[PDB]
RNA sequence: UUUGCUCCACACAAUAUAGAUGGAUACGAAUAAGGCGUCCUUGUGGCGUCGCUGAACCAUAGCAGGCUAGCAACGGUGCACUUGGCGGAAAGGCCUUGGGUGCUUGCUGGCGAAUUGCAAUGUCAUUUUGCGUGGGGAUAAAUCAUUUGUAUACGACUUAGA
RNA sequence: GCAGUCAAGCGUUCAUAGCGACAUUGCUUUUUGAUUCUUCGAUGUCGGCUCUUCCUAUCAUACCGAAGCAGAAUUCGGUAA
RNA sequence: AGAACUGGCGAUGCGGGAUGAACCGAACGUAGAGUUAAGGUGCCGGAAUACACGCUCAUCAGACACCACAAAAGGUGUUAGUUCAUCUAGACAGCCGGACGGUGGCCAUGGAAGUCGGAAUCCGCUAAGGAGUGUGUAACAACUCACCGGCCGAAUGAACUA
RNA sequence: GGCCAGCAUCAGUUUUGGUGGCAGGAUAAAUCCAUAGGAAUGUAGCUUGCCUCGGUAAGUAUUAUAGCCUGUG
């Protein structure tokens, strides 16, 4: 119900996440996916690497610049799934795709915004315990993605800053919860509780 | 010097374990595990809340942290007697979980005039709370 | 074929002037309705005795309810089923509160583990194992231990909404 | 079959403390500290009486309950490593060319040098994993001894030394030259 | 440059909208574990509590929100300012200081609303551009033609020329 | 044309190092047939030259496993175009 | 390539089988509403990321008839069964002890003693030992196993089925 | 007069809810109550051995300081 929904893609079962995102985009919801390098694919890393190499060998024989483009970045892999599940050759599908942004890490605009998850796409909720799974960042690096390390560095920096922010917010929330704990034996609070608040 | 191992306390499927039905004719009532049929199936009894003695899928109920002493296979009369003796209903109504359920039911039951009153009272309380926060 | 009911079916091998009052054969059939119950009765009667539906009649069909449908029992089920290459007799054990529930579990399990469809299965016998230590299957034995307790790790709650704001937990 | 409960016991001697967070085990004993990550097995640890740790698998299949005993063995080997230690004795075997094994330093890294293996002019270098101590044993001819807390690191170092000395392009039934693990036991005697 | 160009402010015009109609409301990690509070011997520590969904939290009353009179309290919030710091992954945002001024529904009053007629999105947003009025700011190049041959089918390239 | 399964035998002994009868299961479409579906208001009919790419049932090169592998040489096999 | 009965395509659109003359469903004037068929309901894509019991992890997984392929033979992979066995009067596995005498049993052979080969398939001591399960010897000698024991203490083994 | 609509009461078709009264079955089977008989995944009691509060492990004990099963009504 937000104008823009930011999904933290960590551990999110790329195909199921893409299905959710395709339906949202076609229904008219603006979606921004962050941390695509932390997306998960069910199955062994070797299985998914072999699948990506099968994808890689497909190319237009007489001109490789015409053939299917093999994007290595995790955001672009997720985008490939999403585009394959969106009717992208039509104007409606094109508009749906403009309604979407996918990022590795969490760039400035969205690091200070709320991140949501999709429970029907979460790996811990969907996969049976013990089932092996792949990480999109590792798969992308194995198939040629060049920016795993810089993304990791910037993510560590962002996490440090966000930890400071959350420590400040937690202190302020403790103060506010203390203030609301007082005046809870007040008459106004009693009427609110009688009304369910 | 002493070994430390995190307990990771789970609620246990066991005779006497109190469960809350989330789907079916009961849909929000408490029952007790009479016994365990399979890893996914239990025979339960809800005589105090009106839940008929029935074999139910464990996926149809939520285990509660409440347990009372009950012999395995106890019939409905015994289950009701032990339930009353252990005062399961009071123990459940004291929990924040049941308190949250009742609060959401009351909020759903509010009328438009009561929502307006809630707004007014919330503003009144917010004034004092913000004043205390600024004083702090 | 569906959620099962048990029926007693009694058939006659229709009387003639030479032989009035024939021998009134009865069976217990697990079927989802009376039409299927009578069809199965005539199928097995054609397997057993020299009679067909045209030369016989159903004397009575009565639904048999579980005597104690809220008592947990262990059932020994003897079945005969057709695999892809032969016919085999099997014995299995099912814990449930009724014969119909045990038979539904039996059909589900046979379909799941041997790809045996309903048409390929004969229920030779269903009988409650009255005494523990007459249960000879471990997958039922392990539920007969004293003070049986077990947790349910990795609880997966279903979300009503597409998006969650909490990064949920699987505690139970 | 999905056995309801499967359980294994881990005896803790007096001098050992086992700190088990979610699945990160830290075993501390007289000989040092060992650490192991077991978040890939989905087991449950529980301390019973400060001398006994139970490890359990609930509703587990055959492979899961096998991994349960694997976990018990791993933690037992951790405790053994911090109490008694682990030592592997390897023999140098050769028909004609004496194998020259030494310890050398390359930017402070403690390699094991193998020279003259089957007369090779190549010099074989096996890095010494941290925590593993190399001693060339007197009173026995051509013996190297690897000692340490972690049986994993000790045995992997011994295996690297053995595999670096594999014979190529020859009938290895006749050319038995190499460095082979002759004994695997504990650093402390008869404990 | 037949008073050009640009920035700001306002006014007036067109121009459309992949589609506002209270708020995209910021830890990280794990899930066979965690969040929070508290305490200490500061830890893979003790204790208590929570989850079982956002069904939340904040906001939210007033001619689409008018004009006025007070009470209580020095709070909340808008604005133009202003102090200082932080933010480069796409920073273009976050935090903060001080004062001014407006509103405050925290509480109690007085006046207004009608006739859009029994509903009609009943017009309140943002997106570019044009033009006018005021104020600030700046005062070039490129191409052709000529020339070069490190270039060259032609284009192109690479050189030179007040 | 290529590849399996069984294993009577060969292999001094030893069925399976390497082979392997009598049988039997297949695969391939670089053989030749079978057919006649397309083309007879026309798809230029052999081979070579040239050039690119693809396949692997791998001749060589890389790393390996097995041997009736002492070495040398060789043979069988694996990943591998 | 040729017959039989029927239904079809030709001559036929429509929904489904992605696609397709023949398959499934259904046959068609122009429209509205409702319900369906076959087929489907993660997204493309209308419609349950429905419910429920199980099974499967594939370094070539599999994923709906016509239909767009796969076999014999195999696998302590995993699952469920059948039958026969051993077992608290101690099952199997694990470590250690014994593993004799008659006897180099008889014969073929240059030599063959349990063990390249044929027949005889015996007992005394016996908890127990085969005229022999293997390694080894030119033949010996010597290790080795069937067999029985010492220790631990509850389930285990074999052949099959799919 | 024409164009576009709103409501009410109806009619035809249909879709989706709330609710009442009957019938049948083993005149449902159950639950419940009463009663008789039992064993156990054996409750109280009792016996033996232990010891860090106080329980435990093995026996006996069929309702007792839990219950359960089957039959009958
Ligand atoms: K032609
Ligand atoms: Mg490249
Ligand atoms: Mg050689
Ligand atoms: Mg031509
Ligand atoms: Mg041509
Ligand atoms: Mg090959
Ligand atoms: Mg023809
Ligand atoms: Mg014709
Ligand atoms: Mg037709
Ligand atoms: Mg098709
Ligand atoms: Mg019509
Ligand atoms: Mg849809
Ligand atoms: Mg087969
Ligand atoms: Mg009507």
Curated annotation (Swiss-Prot), chain A:
GO terms for molecular function: mRNA binding; RNA binding; structural constituent of ribosome. One of its GO terms (cellular component) is cytosol. PROSITE patterns: RIBOSOMAL_L13. The keyword Nucleus does not apply. Keywords: Acetylation, Cytoplasm, Isopeptide bond, Ribonucleoprotein, Ribosomal protein, Ubl conjugation. GO terms for biological process: cytoplasmic translation; maturation of LSU-rRNA; negative regulation of translation. N-terminally acetylated by acetyltransferase NatA. It comes from the Eukaryota. It is found in: Cytoplasm. The keyword Acetylation applies. There is a cross-link at residue 175 (Glycyl lysine isopeptide (Lys-Gly) (interchain with G-Cter in ubiquitin)). InterPro entries: Ribosomal_uL13, Ribosomal_uL13_CS, Ribosomal_uL13_euk/arc, Ribosomal_uL13_sf. Gene3D superfamilies: 1.20.5.4280, Ribosomal protein L13 (3.90.1180.10). NCBIfam families: L13_A_E. Present with 43300 molecules/cell in log phase SD medium. Belongs to the universal ribosomal protein uL13 family. Component of the large ribosomal subunit (LSU). Mature yeast ribosomes consist of a small (40S) and a large (60S) subunit. The 40S small subunit contains 1 molecule of ribosomal RNA (18S rRNA) and 33 different proteins (encoded by 57 genes). The large 60S subunit contains 3 rRNA molecules (25S, 5.8S and 5S rRNA) and 46 different proteins (encoded by 81 genes). Component of the ribosome, a large ribonucleoprotein complex responsible for the synthesis of proteins in the cell. The small ribosomal subunit (SSU) binds messenger RNAs (mRNAs) and translates the encoded message by selecting cognate aminoacyl-transfer RNA (tRNA) molecules. The large subunit (LSU) contains the ribosomal catalytic site termed the peptidyl transferase center (PTC), which catalyzes the formation of peptide bonds, thereby polymerizing the amino acids delivered by tRNAs into a polypeptide chain. This is Large ribosomal subunit protein uL13A.
Curated annotation (Swiss-Prot), chain B:
The keyword Transcription regulation does not apply. Its main location: cytoplasm. N-terminally acetylated by acetyltransferase NatA. GO terms for biological process: cytoplasmic translation; macroautophagy; maturation of LSU-rRNA; ribosomal large subunit assembly; ribosomal large subunit biogenesis. It is found in: Cytoplasm. InterPro entries: KOW, Rib_uL2_dom2, Ribosomal_eL14, Ribosomal_eL14_dom, Translation_prot_SH3-like_sf. CDD domains: eL14. Gene3D superfamilies: 2.30.30.30, 6.10.250.2270. SUPFAM superfamilies: Translation proteins SH3-like domain. Keywords: Acetylation, Cytoplasm, Ribonucleoprotein, Ribosomal protein. One of its GO terms (cellular component) is nucleolus. GO terms for molecular function: RNA binding; structural constituent of ribosome. It comes from the Eukaryota. Component of the large ribosomal subunit (LSU). Mature yeast ribosomes consist of a small (40S) and a large (60S) subunit. The 40S small subunit contains 1 molecule of ribosomal RNA (18S rRNA) and 33 different proteins (encoded by 57 genes). The large 60S subunit contains 3 rRNA molecules (25S, 5.8S and 5S rRNA) and 46 different proteins (encoded by 81 genes). Belongs to the eukaryotic ribosomal protein eL14 family. Component of the ribosome, a large ribonucleoprotein complex responsible for the synthesis of proteins in the cell. The small ribosomal subunit (SSU) binds messenger RNAs (mRNAs) and translates the encoded message by selecting cognate aminoacyl-transfer RNA (tRNA) molecules. The large subunit (LSU) contains the ribosomal catalytic site termed the peptidyl transferase center (PTC), which catalyzes the formation of peptide bonds, thereby polymerizing the amino acids delivered by tRNAs into a polypeptide chain. Present with 45300 molecules/cell in log phase SD medium. This is Large ribosomal subunit protein eL14A. It comes from Saccharomyces cerevisiae (strain ATCC 204508 / S288c). The gene is RPL14A.
From Swiss-Prot, chain C:
Component of the ribosome, a large ribonucleoprotein complex responsible for the synthesis of proteins in the cell. The small ribosomal subunit (SSU) binds messenger RNAs (mRNAs) and translates the encoded message by selecting cognate aminoacyl-transfer RNA (tRNA) molecules. The large subunit (LSU) contains the ribosomal catalytic site termed the peptidyl transferase center (PTC), which catalyzes the formation of peptide bonds, thereby polymerizing the amino acids delivered by tRNAs into a polypeptide chain. Present with 54300 molecules/cell in log phase SD medium. There are 2 genes for eL20 in yeast. The keyword Signal does not apply. Keywords: Cytoplasm, Isopeptide bond, Phosphoprotein, Ribonucleoprotein, Ribosomal protein, Ubl conjugation. There is a cross-link at residues 125, 131, 149 (Glycyl lysine isopeptide (Lys-Gly) (interchain with G-Cter in ubiquitin)). This is Large ribosomal subunit protein eL20A. It comes from the Eukaryota. Belongs to the eukaryotic ribosomal protein eL20 family. HAMAP family: Ribosomal_eL20 (MF_00273). One of its GO terms (molecular function) is structural constituent of ribosome. The keyword Zinc does not apply. GO terms for cellular component: cytosol; cytosolic large ribosomal subunit. It is found in: Cytoplasm. Component of the large ribosomal subunit (LSU). Mature yeast ribosomes consist of a small (40S) and a large (60S) subunit. The 40S small subunit contains 1 molecule of ribosomal RNA (18S rRNA) and 33 different proteins (encoded by 57 genes). The large 60S subunit contains 3 rRNA molecules (25S, 5.8S and 5S rRNA) and 46 different proteins (encoded by 81 genes). eL20 forms multiple interactions with RNA and proteins in the central protuberance, connecting components of core functional centers that are located far apart. InterPro entries: Ribosomal_eL20, Ribosomal_eL20_dom, Ribosomal_eL20_eukaryotes. Coiled coil: none annotated. The lineage of its organism: Eukaryota, Fungi, Dikarya, Ascomycota, Saccharomycotina. GO terms for biological process: cytoplasmic translation. The modification Phosphoserine is found at residue 32. Its main location: cytoplasm.
């Amino acid at each position: 119900v937000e104008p823009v929904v930011v999904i933290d893609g960590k551990g999110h079962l790329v195909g199921r996440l893409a299905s959710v995102v395709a339906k949202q985009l076609l229904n008219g919801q603006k979606i921004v996916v962050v941390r695509a390098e932390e997306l998960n694919i069910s199955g062994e890393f070797f299985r998914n690497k072999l699948k990506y190499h099968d994808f890689l060998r497909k190319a237009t024989a007489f001109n490789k610049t015409r053939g299917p483009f093999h994007f290595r970045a995790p955001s672009r892999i997720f985008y490939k799934a999403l585009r394959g599940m969106v009717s992208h050759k039509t104007a409606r599908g094109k508009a749906a795709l403009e309604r979407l942004k996918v990022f590795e890490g969490i760039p400035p605009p969205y690091d200070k915004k709320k991140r949501v998850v999709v429970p029907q796409a979460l790996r811990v909720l969907r996969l049976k315990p013990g089932r092996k799974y792949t990480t999109l960042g590792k798969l992308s690096t194995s198939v040629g993605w060049k920016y795993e390390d810089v993304v990791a560095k910037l993510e560590a920096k962002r996490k440090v800053s966000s930890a400071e922010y959350y420590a400040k917010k937690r202190a302020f929330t403790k103060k506010v919860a203390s203030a609301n704990a007082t005046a809870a034996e007040s008459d106004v609070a009693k009427q609110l509780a009688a009304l369910g608040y | 010097t002493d070994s430390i191992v995190k307990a990771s306390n789970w609620r246990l499927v066991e005779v006497g374990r109190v469960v809350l039905i989330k789907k079916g004719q009961s849909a929000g009532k408490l029952a007790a595990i009479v016994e365990i049929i399979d890893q996914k199936k239990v025979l339960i009894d809800g005589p105090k809340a009106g839940v008929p003695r029935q074999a139910i899928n464990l996926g149809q109920v939520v285990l509660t942290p409440l347990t009372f002493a009950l012999p395995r296979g106890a019939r409905t009369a015994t289950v009701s007697k032990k339930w009353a003796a252990a005062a399961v209903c009071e123990k459940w109504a004291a929990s924040s979980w049941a308190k949250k359920i009742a609060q959401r039911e009351r909020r759903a039951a509010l009328t438009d005039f009561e929502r307006f009153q809630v707004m007014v009272l919330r503003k009144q309380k917010r004034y004092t709370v913000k004043k205390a926060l600024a004083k702090a | 074929m569906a959620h099962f009911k048990e029926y007693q079916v009694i058939g006659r091998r229709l009387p003639t002037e030479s032989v009035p009052e024939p021998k009134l054969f009865r069976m217990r059939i697990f079927a989802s309705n009376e039409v299927i119950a009578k069809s199965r009765y005539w199928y097995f009667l054609q397997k057993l005795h020299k009679v067909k539906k045209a030369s016989g009649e159903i004397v009575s069909i009565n639904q048999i309810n579980e005597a104690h449908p809220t008592k947990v029992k262990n059932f020994g089920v003897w079945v005969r089923y057709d695999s892809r290459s032969g016919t085999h007799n099997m014995y299995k054990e099912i814990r449930d509160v009724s014969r119909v529930a045990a038979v539904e579990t039996l059909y589900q399990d046979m379909a799941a583990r041997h790809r045996a469809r309903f048409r390929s299965i004969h229920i030779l016998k269903v009988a409650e194992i009255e005494k523990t230590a007459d249960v000879k299957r471990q997958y039922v034995k392990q539920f007969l231990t004293k003070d049986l307790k077990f947790p349910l790790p990795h609880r997966v709650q279903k979300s009503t909404k597409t998006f969650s704001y909490k990064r949920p937990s699987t505690f139970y | 079959m999905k056995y309801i409960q499967t359980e294994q016991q881990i005896e803790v001697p007096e001098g050992v403390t086992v700190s088990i967070k979610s699945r990160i085990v830290k075993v501390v004993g007289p000989r040092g500290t060992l650490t192991k990550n077991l978040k890939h097995i989905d087991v449950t640890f529980t301390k019973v009486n400060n001398q006994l740790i139970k490890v359990a698998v609930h509703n587990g299949g055959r492979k899961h309950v096998a991994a349960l005993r694997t976990v018990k063995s791993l933690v037992d080997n951790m405790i053994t490593g911090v109490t008694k230690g682990y030592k592997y004795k390897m023999r140098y075997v050769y028909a004609h060319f004496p194998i020259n094994v030494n310890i050398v330093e390359k930017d402070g890294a403690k390699f094991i040098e193998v020279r003259n293996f089957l007369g090779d002019k190549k010099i074989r270098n096996v890095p010494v994993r941290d925590g593993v101590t190399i001693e060339f044993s007197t009173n026995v001819k051509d013996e190297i001894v690897l000692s340490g807390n972690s049986v994993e690191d000790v045995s992997q170092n011994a295996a690297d030394l053995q595999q670096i000395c594999r014979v190529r392009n020859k009938d290895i039934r006749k050319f038995l030259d190499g460095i082979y693990v002759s004994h695997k036991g504990f650093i402390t005697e008869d404990l």
